Design a protein around this ligand. Structure first.
Ligand SMILES: Cc1ncc(C[n+]2csc(CCOP(=O)(O)OP(=O)(O)O)c2C)c(N)n1
Ligand SMILES: Cc1ncc(C[n+]2csc(CCOP(=O)(O)OP(=O)(O)O)c2C)c(N)n1
Ligand code: SF4
Ligand code: SF4
Ligand code: SF4
Ligand SMILES: [Ca+2]
Ligand SMILES: [Cl-]
Ligand SMILES: [Cl-]
Ligand SMILES: [Mg+2]
Ligand SMILES: [Mg+2]
Lengths: 1231, 247, 123, 62, 123
């Protein structure tokens, strides 16, 4: 029958989707990814659907591909489903019109997420589902984890019987990722509700050659309209079908629903109409306020489409005088948002009582929608009655926002315990909170709720957990604001974040720190925290988690210790039972290996319980002395916008603080100085050979080579040790490798590859280096970078250039960032970057941190992220603009040459025209023109003067991952390269979709383990490089920094200088690959990648062919036989060996075979005498001709599609035979 | 000056679009194909736009590609246009949110055509344009061949001054292929109506490494909402601007 | 065996007539004879080279094996299972029901650098 | 809405909004919905509002 | 054997044999074909075609290459050859024909072939 379970919205709906579906065509997209991944695990685990079959799951190249496959499967008689959101759902729209148009029982489960407009957002709102409201899909909304399960079932059942496809949706993150103890139905029960007759009819009407039909005809004006209206009967019946299934499911669960459900005072005068998770919070507020006499209510929308006015009114109290409809979206220019318009139509069509109707907007991109905000909405109805308002933001620009009084009382039911946990990424806090939820939920009658807030930072990020436990159902779909228990698992947070905000008087505050003594506590603990703890009489507890963990042998890992603190001090369970339950689970979990691991954890709990003693503080804390402001100098923007955001105060920024178009300035990451590395490198000048390889390899630009003259080191700190610069061109200069200890992430790549056997770089604890290196970095940062001493494209010389991408939020040791940083050192000042969505767009531009910066002249990469699927085309567009605008400039230049412009101006114009597409000459003469035309505002010379930012030849680059290049954006990439235009594509191949959670891509290699390839991928890596080389006119090359930095620089210059399309594919290490010895071995792994023959290096240059030479050049050597160790050194291959040794062995052998054959193929290519060597180009001229001009026979048909303004002339339509046949017939019928 | 000519909605519109644009990224789809082809012919014949230049036209692999290229060209400071309808317009929706979200003066000319549901139809109705009403584009309708010319001009002028993209649409076939004797304006007259300062500001704020900025950031719950509402002032001015240019 | 098989023969030299017998090529010759001449010669060059490549492919002895399918095995494993270092980041994009467990996040250096530091410090 | 009402005769007692589309299951097509909202927000006279569909796929509208 | 089952289970409506009887339209192995022109295969549907072929599943794609977007009025496609005149290639296409065949052959596990009825009906 039923069974309890603690899970999230995603898992709750996947539970139903799996049972009710035979096929699933999918594509990953946050936050719906989980559903597809759970389904894949269950299929592999042996889980069967209601037909006793394992679900047939397939991953497509994009959501457009998934929707097409879903359509085909349904048309062919298989129950199908998919999971999507936001951008993904948008790509499915075309097929949605077809799926509903053909009355197919499909079911889409959508985690409603914001659409990218001024910015991208992975968070929740209804912008995406509203975008598909005209597709013909029925739309059913769930407002909670429990409802997600129930509505998912109703949707499937209703789709089958009604023949109208359904879109079941719930709020992204707020419901999809919220954990709750709920009740789920067994698959057998779900199966008993299926309408067998309807199912049989579905199979019988489906596509099959034994009883075929034609679908998807093309129709003329004579019958189209009629065909479109023929489905009317089916839509008129779906509402009743949905209502009936809600009742049938209710007979099994005890949870009843209606198309529209009402809660609140039966005589309510003020009513809110809402949809989604907001309904839970609204109802919670209503229970609280109605108890005080307020005549308020709420209408929850379940079935949004079709919209049945009769059901809406059945839920509307006749006493309602004011009604506000809340829409979780924004449609610019519309007279109102979707739900509001539907409700308005209901009242106008009814033609009776006309209550005051107001429209309100809330929760865009998961913006909080708290009780206080609900209070604002109700207050507005009895007060100002502002219409078309916004709530949750301060709109000081257009004044559409409602004021929110955060002094509103807590509205959670009696008995609810609320907890907040501040953790550091990878410290296990989240995992422990989740285990706590499971443990408590499975061993008590308490409802449990969990929600986690993460960081945009990938490494050393902060996590904030919000947990609730209670005797009454938890409808609090909002963060905890008044906690009974607050734990801070990282002492560093004490001075940077307002951790005790809203904590209840007498609340419990647990802190993880080594400040045991009262003197130490008073020393490190800020006065603000002291006063709060004192004034609120907080049960303050301090525990040196690190010390205890180390003592019990848990190597300083604090997760078990802080878990004990929660179980003992949270107050959710009686101490006795708590510790008991915790220990029992320690055996459940762990226990895997020797009883030692279990004992260590057991001891950890015991030791913790003992040490968890209330820290007694003096009453003098009542008014501790407030400190001053030791804030260093920074940007106005950083202090007014980014810092507030970084300190978790972004919500307080008003609308006026942002740019209407969403742009952010470059370089804001310069002031973050996070200092999250545990260990950083220490330079050892006595062993340094001054090679600059360390700075070259850094994934965060944390190493600054310093080349200064004696006079520049006058005020240099005492320990600013410098060496005599080696090299003939550096004679006289001093050299120093300055470590940026606060921006370093502690990966270890630099020290790992530092040449000398006696390392010139040694890893040391951050605390033993910062005091000395911080002031040194500041001083060094002020020394002019010597970019003219050595060639810009030489290994050493490149590092004497200003890096224009620094301190990004990429993981420590990331294999993508080193490549990008170097690229900016060669072309940064004149490049455009069209970045595909993915890790590179995330570490590249997650607000408010912008790692790309400008050089000393204010020049820097013009960066932009359009979408995930259009990076190439986006970049192609930038190139088109430059072509058009610079062609315009050239036209004016030519015109100016035939005028009376001065001799100097003509000389420069002539020079510029000649070196127009040459980086060096265009800048040389452009700079002359900037001086010569300075101040010119009149006529021709004035126009040319205003186009100065177009003088130097620009470099258009398209950055993207393998997922973009090999899958979703491949069609566009292919077309752009085929265009022959001057664009540069740089692919960072991580061999998986990294940012979304490691899903397999067509770039994933044979045998590699990744999501949707959990048994090891069974198809080889797609050979993108060889496919593109078939064009012959596209420059193609592969690189691997770790193997050869020289080859990499060579490729960059050759690719960028090629006057046509260039494609460079780089081997990028990634945490998803599971490097066994650490990401600090990235360079070494990149080296082996090539040596093993796994990743061969080569260059395909069309200009060699143009001069009679073989365009293909092999840059690496034949496999050296180390591939086996290369693979086993990565968990993505090693895990398969541990789990399925048989297949793993075979798959790794297959890989060895693939690279052997491929290298041999590359060798032949390098020796061939076969290649095109024809005219480079030339021609074009002025004029054109139509393909049908002067044709002997009709060249166009009698269809409306070919009709054109000039078509319609008489011609031979080939209905009289061949020219010869007609001539012969004429001769034969002479007459 | 004015000129009396006999042509269809497609050509009347292309007449204006060619004059007011520097770049066009296109893809063929009935019944809008004629506009792009007319544009390509004129560029070959050396016809100059209001900037005295021939239009830069490129054909993409699909409308999704055309929309991405339009977005890129606009982002990089080039006045850009495209021609589409039905299925093609649906593929441009993702980029339309981006184009309006970044307040770019793009102009889409659409021959309103039915969407493929129970069947495909190349004929006219407003199914396609209504499917894009939430993208943030201003939407201006023309109801005759003569109006197609006039509204096309208003759309370009208003898009330039307002920084809000426009979708000028007219009925597929019923207006796009109907031939009528109408009067068109010379390109010089169109140029005289352009707000030159708004145009220069459009170029100054565009992408350029000589004075870079970051666009298309990823935003958390703390600021996304405020960022989405920041464009209100621009939409508030659109109506008045359209009204003024009509005059 | 070599998977590639050529079924037609080397260009017979009739391409010029082939192209000129179609208006799509002939119309260019009448309007832009200079360019048409070059482009037709380019086509002939393209097909000459491509046929030679096809001939090479037909003569090569370099190629992989082949297997329709087979295997899979009833089961699967996550790519992060048993990994020495974290395989997922601190982003909400990588967050999953079973994520959240502590791990070495690569902020302390490689395995050996860590082991060496321990040795060099001990105490 | 202000421009819509500036074109509406005060004498109008019945208004028909014609939409050249079909949104299955919607309470009404787009233009009709916008017009309804205009009247609802005005809060004044409420003439009878009718919704009509025409011209799908170039269907004649004579 | 499917035809034998249709006779042996005729009338069977109950139990397991009844279920199998109701699935007779599934007895014979079906042949799934994807038909499309060059514009589809080389341009707009290329990313999808590429992915489907890469899947290794039993599907058959038949491409009718007219070297132009035919139905819509003769626009150029990446399948259009050098020097051919078509819409948007009004001075003769200046880029060569995309080699779809050779691109797909790089997978090694996809059957690829070219045909021309006029040259050989047997081939
Ligand atoms: C249309 C659409 N579908 C799906 C997604 C979700 N998504 C964004 S990036 C990404 C994977 C990126 O992988 P890759 O291109 O390899 O870059 P990486 O993160 O590995 O560097 C996915 C599935 C999206 N943003 N838009
Ligand atoms: C998304 C989308 N964009 C554009 C069109 C218009 N369209 C339909 S078929 C077609 C060309 C067909 O060319 P091809 O695939 O070569 O087949 P052929 O007609 O030449 O046999 C075009 C441009 C469409 N139906 N859908
Ligand atoms: S340890 Fe890593 S992040 Fe730190 S300076 Fe070295 S390479 Fe850079
Ligand atoms: S890698 Fe080592 S030897 Fe080379 S410059 Fe850096 S510290 Fe010196
Ligand atoms: S590519 Fe991999 S290592 Fe780099 S930021 Fe992404 S997940 Fe981290
Ligand atoms: Ca290039
Ligand atoms: Cl995502
Ligand atoms: Cl078409
Ligand atoms: Mg990747
Ligand atoms: Mg064709």
């Amino acid at each position: 029958g039923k069974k309890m379970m603690t899970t999230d919205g995603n898992t709750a709906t996947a539970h139903v989707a799996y049972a009710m579906s035979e096929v699933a065509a999918i594509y990953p997209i946050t936050p719906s990814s989980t559903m597809g991944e759970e389904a894949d695990d269950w299929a592999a685990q042996g889980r069967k659907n209601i037909f006793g079959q394992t679900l047939t799951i397939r991953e497509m190249q994009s959501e457009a591909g998934a929707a097409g496959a879903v359509h085909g499967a349904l048309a062919a008689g298989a129950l199908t489903t998919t999971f999507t959101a936001s951008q993904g759902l948008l790509l499915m729209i075309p097929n949605m019109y077809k799926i509903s148009g053909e009355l197919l029982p499909g079911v889409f489960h959508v985690t409603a997420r914001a659409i990218a407009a001024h910015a991208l957002s992975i968070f929740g709102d209804h912008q995406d589902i509203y975008a598909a409201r005209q597709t013909g899909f029925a739309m059913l909304a769930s407002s909670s984890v429990q409802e997600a399960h129930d509505m998912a079932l109703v949707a499937h059942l209703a789709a089958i019987e009604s023949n109208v496809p359904f879109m079941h949706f719930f709020d992204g993150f707020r419901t999809s990722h919220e954990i709750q103890k709920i009740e789920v139905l067994d698959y057998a029960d779900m199966a008993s509700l299926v309408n067998q007759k309807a199912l049989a009819e579905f199979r019988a009407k489906s596509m099959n050659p034994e009883h075929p039909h034609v679908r998807g005809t093309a129709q003329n004006p004579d019958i189209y309209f009629q065909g479109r209206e023929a489905a009317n009967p089916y839509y008129l019946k779906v509402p009743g079908i949905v209502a009936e299934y809600m009742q049938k499911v209710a007979s099994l669960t005890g949870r009843s629903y209606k198309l529209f459900d009402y809660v609140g005072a039966p005589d309510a005068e003020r009513v809110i109409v809402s949809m989604g998770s907001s309904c839970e919070t609204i109802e919670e507020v209503i229970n609280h306020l109605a108890a005080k006499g307020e005549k308020i209510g709420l209408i929850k929308v379940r079935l949004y489409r079709p919209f049945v006015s009769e059901a809406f009114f059945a839920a509307l109290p006749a006493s309602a005088k004011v009604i506000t409809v809340l829409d979780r979206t924004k449609e610019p220019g519309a007279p109102g948002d979707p739900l509001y318009l539907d409700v308005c139509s209901a009242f106008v069509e009814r033609g009776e009582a006309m209550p005051k109707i107001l429209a309100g907007r809330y929760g865009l991109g998961s913006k909080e929608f708290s009780p206080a905000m609900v209070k604002s909405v109700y207050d507005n109805m009895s007060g100002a009655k502002k219409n078309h308002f916004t709530v949750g933001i301060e709109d000081d620009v257009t004044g559409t926002s409602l004021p929110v009084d955060n002094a509103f009382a807590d509205t959670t039911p009696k008995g609810t315990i609320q907890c907040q946990f501040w953790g550091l990424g990878a410290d296990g806090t989240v995992g422990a909170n989740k285990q706590a939820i499971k443990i408590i939920g499975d061993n008590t009658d308490l409802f449990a709720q969990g929600y986690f807030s993460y960081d945009s930072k990938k490494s050393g990020g902060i996590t904030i957990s919000h947990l609730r436990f209670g005797e009454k159902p938890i409808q609090s779909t909002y963060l905890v604001n008044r906690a009974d228990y607050v734990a801070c698992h990282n002492p560093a947070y004490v001075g940077i974040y307002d951790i005790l905000e809203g904590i209840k008087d007498g609340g419990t505050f647990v802190l993880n720190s080594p400040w045991s003594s009262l003197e130490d506590m008073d020393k490190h603990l800020p006065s603000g925290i002291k006063r709060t703890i004192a004034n609120k009489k907080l049960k303050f507890y301090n525990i040196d988690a690190v010390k205890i963990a180390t003592d019990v042998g848990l190597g300083g890992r604090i997760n078990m210790i802080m878990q004990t603190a929660f179980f003992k001090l949270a107050g959710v369970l009686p101490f006795e039972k708590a510790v008991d339950l915790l220990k029992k689970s320690i055996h459940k979990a762990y226990g895997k290996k020797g009883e030692k691991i279990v004992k260590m954890n057991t001891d950890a709990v015991d030791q913790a319980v003992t040490s968890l003693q209330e820290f007694k503080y003096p009453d003098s804390w009542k008014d501790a002395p407030a400190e001053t402001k030791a804030e260093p100098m920074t940007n106005e923007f950083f202090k007014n916008v980014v810092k507030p955001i970084l300190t978790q105060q972004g919500d307080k920024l008003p609308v006026s603080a942002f740019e209407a178009d969403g742009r952010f300035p470059l370089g804001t990451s310069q002031f973050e100085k996070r200092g999250v590395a545990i260990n950083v490198p220490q330079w050892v000048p006595e062993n340094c050979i001054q090679c600059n390889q360390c700075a070259f390899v850094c994934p965060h630009s944390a190493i600054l080579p310093v080349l200064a003259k004696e006079e520049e080191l006058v005020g240099a700190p005492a320990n600013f040790t410098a060496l005599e610069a080696k090299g003939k061109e550096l004679k006289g200069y001093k050299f120093r490798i300055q470590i940026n200890t606060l921006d370093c992430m502690g990966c270890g790549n630099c020290a790992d590859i530092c040449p000398p056997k006696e390392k010139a770089l040694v890893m040391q604890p951050l605390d033993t280096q910062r005091d000395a290196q911080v002031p040194n970095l500041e001083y060094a940062a002020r020394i002019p970078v010597k970019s003219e001493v050595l060639p810009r494209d030489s290994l050493k010389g490149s590092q004497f250039q200003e890096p224009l991408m620094e301190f990004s939020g990429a993981c420590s040791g990331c294999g993508e960032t080193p490549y990008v940083r170097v690229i900016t050192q060669l072309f940064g000042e004149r490049m455009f970057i069209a970045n595909a969505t993915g890790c590179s767009s995330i570490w590249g531009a997650s607000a408010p941190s912008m790692p790309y910066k400008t050089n000393r002249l204010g020049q820097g990469p013009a960066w932009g992220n359009s979408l995930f699927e259009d990076a190439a085309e986006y970049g192609f567009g930038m190139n088109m603009s430059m072509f058009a605008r610079r062609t315009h400039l050239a036209d004016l230049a030519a015109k100016a040459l035939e005028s009376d412009a001065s001799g100097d101006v003509k000389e420069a114009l002539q020079g510029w025209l000649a070196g127009k597409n040459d980086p060096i000459k265009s800048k040389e003469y452009g700079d002359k023109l900037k001086k010569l035309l300075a101040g010119q505002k009149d006529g021709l010379l004035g126009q040319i003067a205003a186009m100065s930012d177009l003088y130097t030849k620009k470099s258009v680059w398209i950055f993207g991952g393998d997922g973009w290049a090999y899958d979703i954006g491949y069609g566009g990439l292919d077309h752009v390269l085929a265009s022959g235009e001057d664009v540069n594509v740089f692919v960072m191949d991580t061999e998986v979709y990294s940012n979304t959670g490691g899903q397999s891509s067509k770039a994933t290699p044979t045998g590699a383990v990744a999501k949707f390839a959990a048994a090891g991928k069974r198809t080889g890596k797609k050979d993108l490089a060889r496919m593109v080389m078939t064009y012959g006119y596209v420059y193609v090359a592969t690189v691997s920094m770790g193997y050869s930095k020289q080859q990499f620089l060579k490729v960059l210059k050759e690719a960028e200088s090629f006057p046509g399309p260039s494609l460079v594919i780089a081997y990028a290490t990634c945490i998803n690959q599971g490097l066994r010895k650490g990401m600090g071995k990235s360079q070494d792994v990149m080296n082996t990648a090539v040596k093993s023959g796994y990743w061969p290096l080569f260059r395909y240059d069309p200009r060699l062919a143009a001069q009679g030479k073989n365009p293909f050049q092999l840059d690496s050597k034949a496999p050296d036989g180390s591939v086996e160790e290369f693979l086993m050194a990565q968990n993505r291959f090693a895990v398969l060996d541990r789990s399925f040794p048989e297949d793993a062995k075979r798959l790794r052998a297959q890989v060895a075979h693939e690279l052997d054959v491929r290298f041999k193929e590359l060798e032949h290519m390098a020796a061939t005498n076969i290649f095109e060597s024809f005219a480079p180009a030339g021609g074009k001229a002025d004029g054109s001709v139509d393909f049908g001009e002067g044709a002997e026979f009709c060249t166009r048909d009698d269809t409306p599609m070919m009709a054109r303004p000039d078509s319609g002339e008489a011609c031979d339509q080939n209905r009289a035979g061949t020219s010869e046949q007609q001539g012969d017939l004429s001769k034969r019928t002479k007459k």
